[PDB]
Scaffold this active site. Structure first.
Site, short mmCIF file in Angstrom:
data_model
loop_
_atom_site.label_atom_id
_atom_site.label_comp_id
_atom_site.label_asym_id
_atom_site.label_seq_id
_atom_site.Cartn_x
_atom_site.Cartn_y
_atom_site.Cartn_z
N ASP A 90 0.83 -1.21 0.00
CA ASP A 90 0.00 0.00 0.00
C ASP A 90 0.86 1.25 0.00
O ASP A 90 0.49 2.28 -0.59
CB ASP A 90 -0.92 0.01 1.22
CG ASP A 90 -2.00 -1.05 1.14
OD1 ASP A 90 -2.24 -1.58 0.03
OD2 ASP A 90 -2.61 -1.34 2.19
N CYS B 59 -1.86 2.88 -12.42
CA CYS B 59 -2.04 2.56 -11.01
C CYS B 59 -3.30 3.28 -10.53
O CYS B 59 -4.31 3.23 -11.25
CB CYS B 59 -0.76 2.89 -10.21
SG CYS B 59 -0.16 4.62 -10.36
N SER B 60 -3.29 3.91 -9.36
CA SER B 60 -4.46 4.69 -8.98
C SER B 60 -4.45 6.07 -9.67
O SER B 60 -5.44 6.47 -10.26
CB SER B 60 -4.53 4.88 -7.47
OG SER B 60 -5.71 5.56 -7.08
N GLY C 69 -1.79 7.04 -11.87
CA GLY C 69 -0.90 7.06 -13.03
C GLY C 69 0.36 7.88 -12.73
O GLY C 69 0.70 8.85 -13.41
N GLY D 177 3.88 7.37 -9.62
CA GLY D 177 5.13 6.69 -9.36
C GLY D 177 5.21 5.21 -9.71
O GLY D 177 6.18 4.76 -10.31
N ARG D 178 4.21 4.42 -9.32
CA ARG D 178 4.28 2.97 -9.60
C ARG D 178 4.30 2.71 -11.10
O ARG D 178 5.02 1.83 -11.58
CB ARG D 178 3.08 2.25 -9.01
CG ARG D 178 2.94 2.36 -7.51
CD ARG D 178 1.80 1.47 -7.06
NE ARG D 178 1.46 1.67 -5.67
CZ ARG D 178 0.45 1.06 -5.07
NH1 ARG D 178 -0.31 0.19 -5.74
NH2 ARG D 178 0.20 1.31 -3.79
N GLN E 123 8.27 8.84 -8.59
CA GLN E 123 7.98 10.01 -7.80
C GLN E 123 8.66 10.08 -6.44
O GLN E 123 8.56 11.08 -5.74
CB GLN E 123 6.48 10.27 -7.77
CG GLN E 123 5.74 9.75 -6.61
CD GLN E 123 4.24 9.93 -6.77
OE1 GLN E 123 3.54 8.98 -7.09
NE2 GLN E 123 3.73 11.14 -6.54
#
Ligand SMILES: [Mg+2]
Ligand code: NA
Ligand code: NA
Length: 284
Positions: free
Chosen positions: A185, A219-220, A222, A224-225, A263
Site C-alpha cells: 500500500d 495505477c491509482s 498514473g 510513481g508505480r 515520484q
C-alpha cells in the site's frame, strides 16, 4: 543546465550504485534531485476545465496538454498521457485508475488507440480506501462499456499477478490485462524479483504484439508505480541488447511526458536495486 542522461557501463554498475548509496545516499540523492524539475514547464489547462473536473480521480494529478491522449468526438478528455519507450515515441499510455464514471472512456481509448496489452499496478481497494474501479467484468458474461461490448474469456490468478484475456468489439480484438498484485500500500515492493519477473512476462507479450498501439499502464493516479514499471521495462530491454544502462535517462524521458513518473527516491533506488540484482544473477 541539467543532465538528460547518465549512462553506466554494465560491468561498472554494481560499484556505481554503491558509490551513489555511500554516505547515507549522498550522491544518489544529488542525482535524483537533478530530475526534480523535468517536464514542469508544461501546463495542464485542458484537464483543469470545469467540464472535466469529474473525470479526474485526483484534482492535482493531471495530464500535460502537450502529451495528453484525446478521445474522438465532442468530449475528448481523458486523464491519460503518451509516454516514449526505447523503441517508439508513443510506446505507452499512462492513465489513472478508471472511475465508475470514466470506465467507458477508458475502454473507448483502448479501442481507438489499438491497445492490446493493459498493465495494472494497483489494487481496487487498499485498507478500505477506493483506489481504482473494478472496470472489467466479474465473470465471463458480456457487458457494454459505452459503444463497445466486452467479454472476459479467462482469468488466471497467480501468486504475484493475475492475467486476464478480453474479447472486445466496437465500431473484434483480443486484449490481455496484467494485474500485479503484490505492490504494498505504501513504498516499494518487498523484493526486486517480483517486479522484474512481472515486467519480463509483460514484455514477452508486448513483443508478440508487433501490430499493437501503445501499451496502457496504470495505477491509482498514473504516477510513481506506473513510472517505475515503465522505467524497469525500458532498462531491462537495455540490459538485454546493450553494454550500457541509463536509468537516469529513462526517468528523465518519462518525466518529460507526465508528472510524477517515478515520484520518490525510494522508487529510484529500487530501479537501481533491480538492475543490480539482474546483473548479480547473471554472474552466477
Ligand atoms: Mg450478469
Ligand atoms: Na451491458
Ligand atoms: Na515509494
Amino acid at each position: 543546465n541539467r543532465k538528460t542522461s547518465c549512462p553506466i557501463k554494465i560491468n561498472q554498475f554494481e560499484g556505481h550504485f554503491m558509490k551513489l548509496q555511500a554516505d547515507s545516499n549522498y550522491l544518489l540523492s544529488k542525482e535524483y534531485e537533478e530530475l526534480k524539475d523535468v517536464g514542469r514547464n508544461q501546463s495542464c489547462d485542458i484537464a483543469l476545465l470545469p467540464e472535466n473536473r469529474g473525470k479526474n480521480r485526483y484534482n492535482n494529478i493531471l495530464p500535460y496538454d502537450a502529451t495528453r491522449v484525446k478521445l474522438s468526438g465532442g468530449s475528448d478528455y481523458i486523464n491519460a498521457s503518451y509516454i516514449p519507450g526505447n523503441n517508439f515515441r508513443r510506446e505507452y499510455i499512462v492513465t489513472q485508475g478508471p472511475l465508475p464514471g470514466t470506465k467507458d472512456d477508458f475502454w473507448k481509448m483502448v479501442w481507438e488507440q489499438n491497445v492490446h496489452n493493459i498493465v495494472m499496478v494497483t489494487q481496487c481497494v487498499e485498507k478500505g480506501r477506493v483506489k481504482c474501479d473494478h472496470y472489467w467484468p466479474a465473470d465471463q458474461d458480456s457487458l457494454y462499456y459505452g459503444d463497445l461490448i466486452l467479454q472476459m474469456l479467462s482469468e488466471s490468478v497467480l501468486p504475484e499477478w493475475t492475467i486476464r484475456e478480453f474479447k472486445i468489439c466496437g465500431e473484434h480484438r483480443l486484449i490481455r490485462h496484467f494485474h500485479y498484485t503484490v505492490w504494498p500500500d505504501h513504498g516499494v515492493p518487498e523484493t526486486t524479483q517480483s517486479l522484474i519477473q512481472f515486467v519480463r512476462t509483460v514484455r514477452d507479450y508486448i513483443n508478440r504484439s508487433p501490430g499493437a498501439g501503445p501499451t496502457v499502464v496504470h495505477c491509482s493516479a498514473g504516477v510513481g508505480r506506473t513510472g517505475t514499471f515503465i522505467a524497469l521495462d525500458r532498462i531491462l530491454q537495455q540490459l538485454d541488447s546493450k553494454d550500457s544502462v541509463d536509468i537516469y535517462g529513462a526517468v528523465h524521458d518519462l518525466r518529460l511526458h507526465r508528472v510524477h513518473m517515478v515520484q520518490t527516491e525510494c522508487q529510484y533506488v529500487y530501479l537501481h536495486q533491480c538492475v543490480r540484482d539482474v546483473l548479480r544473477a547473471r554472474k552466477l
